């Protein structure tokens, strides 16, 4: 900047307004198959090489497609998402957006999180939900929804998100693969780092889906039995799981009895009154010394400008947009709810991965 | 210590995919009138005071509205866009998203760029274009546009952007206000920092609109005659201006004769062959020792990870999305075009403001 500091203020303002460009560009680079080619490459590749390898079809305008991809990747290079090298061309190049010199690109480490295959410890499924147009369009109606005290999503589509999925099979698939992708990674990391399944006879997984989380947990605690508690329609679609009883119900009526209850990414959908109802049912269903295991992000007590804190408040806003009064909570807030619900002044927190903690409350 | 690394990398991937949240939250805080309250406030104010000052209307759910705005502001505070202080509540609170303690917010300096009339000059009209739904939607169709070698805009709406604006008066207004806003800031900055208007008898402003740029330029260089040259339909609606001749025409036919020709944000709309045609007309229009003055961003010849270079590549992708073959160019590329068009190996560059340079080529 011309110093000024005024100039840098101005450019900073523009950066803030333009923060959508990176996500949308990475999505394009993924969809085009360019990202997968960067992830399987032995060396830096030009846009021309990356297009020829990603795309089988004959392209109507092959030179234009190549210079556009170059421009995509050059921008991602300025944000450190890919590495760029520039070399002089012996002649002239028709597939670069510069005609002295060719740029070649390689994946930065972070790009492994966008892989379509591998062992599928990627966040791509969750990424195509985050950048799904149907979900993104809600973010344009925040203002009106705040004024009405409503969820932006419901102001955009006229019903709650979970109801809307019922009318939209493709979005419903994107949503379920994202949730399953996330649950897969957290469950593996939970089994690596968390010790609070040891000694449990019966684990109730509230929102257990097809019961895969209980299966994977039981793979490690063979003597443990599980209750996959989920809505009657979700229970129905579930194949039998050795050691696991599938039970249908609403967590608002009742939760099955067990030594521990697992709530993964449940309470953040709901406001305090609903969360105190879920936790009171957790209470009545446990014996003394039984616990709730809450798998959730935890927002700091004050808005720190760190990578973790930003991530957390960003998930908060995603809950705002999605559900309105669903929210991300501090540890203190999780504690207050657990205490309102009758749980004791005995709190454990174990950091798992990607801002998810396992918080444990004891009856 | 490679768990830390895997975790950091994963969070960085999520940050990259979630970078739309900031722009969209800023838009909400502005549209709600909260940003202007921040900009005129004496001290830090709570979301509840900010909503009470910004909203005249009566609200159906005022507590919910307040806690939602708190959540928006807390997130912007984690991005350093606003300042936040936290104080214990010695009473009874449900208008922050925590009951123990109230957050109060103040504007960071960067927020003056988001003024409606809050604090001064601002890039709000430009940002309302940037975050306009119609323009943003195009970013979702980059993948297919690349494959067909087309502008994402054309692939989303079935025709080019200038065509489409003719059929959408509200968006045509948004587009024109953004360009007037940016032209106004840059003209003022040009008169502070640029010295290439001195000694000119006749300056031709190609695309001059209603002729404000020459008026303000004449406001400083009294003996300068302007020619405000633009499309016949734009010249129709222009009130007279002392010392400025309004001439309708197209720049691809002819340019009026002059000592200098000003091209502000014209060449970046067009591919090389179109830019060389514009500049060859600029050539023929000038006497020897006359100048073309180009007002443009200038990309670095390599993708540096600085605020400035990211800004410039961000504008290049905006041109890609909007026009396809519109592009930002390096200094060498601007030079190659000018020399193709007959200009001397005699090149000047003066940095203006918000990434804009005034480059001058001589005959
Ligand atoms: N604060 C609140 O908004 C609040 C508070 C208390 C109760 N509620 C409940 O919300 C209901 C909304 O009506 P409805 O007819 O759409 O709901 P419903 O008849 O399906 O009630 C069951 C509820 O369980 C939820 N649920 C989500 N995951 C679950 C899981 N794994 N297992 C069990 N239940 C799960 C569903 O979203 C659903 O809202 C009200 O009837 C009320 O009982 C809301
Ligand atoms: N790449 C090219 O140069 C290209 C493509 C097709 C045709 N052509 C030829 O070049 C000309 C371009 O076609 P057209 O008849 O649509 O021309 P035009 O006068 O409509 O110019 C096209 C665009 O340039 C801009 N423009 C032109 N002069 C301007 C001025 N004085 N101020 C501000 N904006 C201005 C406007 O946005 C306009 O939509 C024709 O004479 C045609 O034969 C050129
Ligand atoms: C004709 O000049 C233009 C400039 C612009 C600049 C937009 C822009 C976007 C983001 C920024 O940070 C700065 C400018 C856009 C245009 O068509 C939509 C045309
Ligand atoms: C029920 O749990 C949900 C989790 C989420 C998680 C989304 C997300 C967004 C960005 C990230 O960086 C991580 C997760 C979204 C939901 O509705 C859209 C529901």
Numbering used by the authors:
A (entry chain B), B (entry chain A): 15 to 377
What does the primary publication say about this deposited structure?
To rationalize their different catalytic regioselectivities, structural analyses involving X-ray crystallography and computational methods were conducted. All complexes were in high structural resemblance and depicted as a homodimer with an open conformation. Of the three hydroxyl groups on resveratrol capable of forming hydrogen bonds, only the methyl-accepting 3-OH group (A-ring) formed direct hydrogen bonds to SbSOMT residues, including the catalytic residues His282 (2.80 Å) and Asp283 (3.26 Å).
A stilbene O-methyltransferase, SbSOMT, is first shown to be indispensable for pathogen-inducible pterostilbene (3,5-bis-O-methylated) biosynthesis in sorghum (Sorghum bicolor). Phylogenetic analysis indicates the recruitment of genus-specific SOMTs from canonical caffeic acid O-methyltransferases (COMTs) after the divergence of Sorghum spp. from Saccharum spp. In recombinant enzyme assays, SbSOMT and COMTs regioselectively catalyze O-methylation of stilbene A-ring and B-ring respectively. Whilst SbSOMT shows global structural resemblance to SbCOMT, molecular characterizations illustrate two hydrophobic residues (Ile144/Phe337) crucial for substrate binding orientation leading to 3,5-bis-O-methylations in the A-ring. The catalytic residues of SbSOMT are highly conserved with all reported COMTs, including His282 as the key nucleophile, whereas Asp283, Glu310, and Glu342 collectively charge the basicity or confine His282 in its reactive conformation.
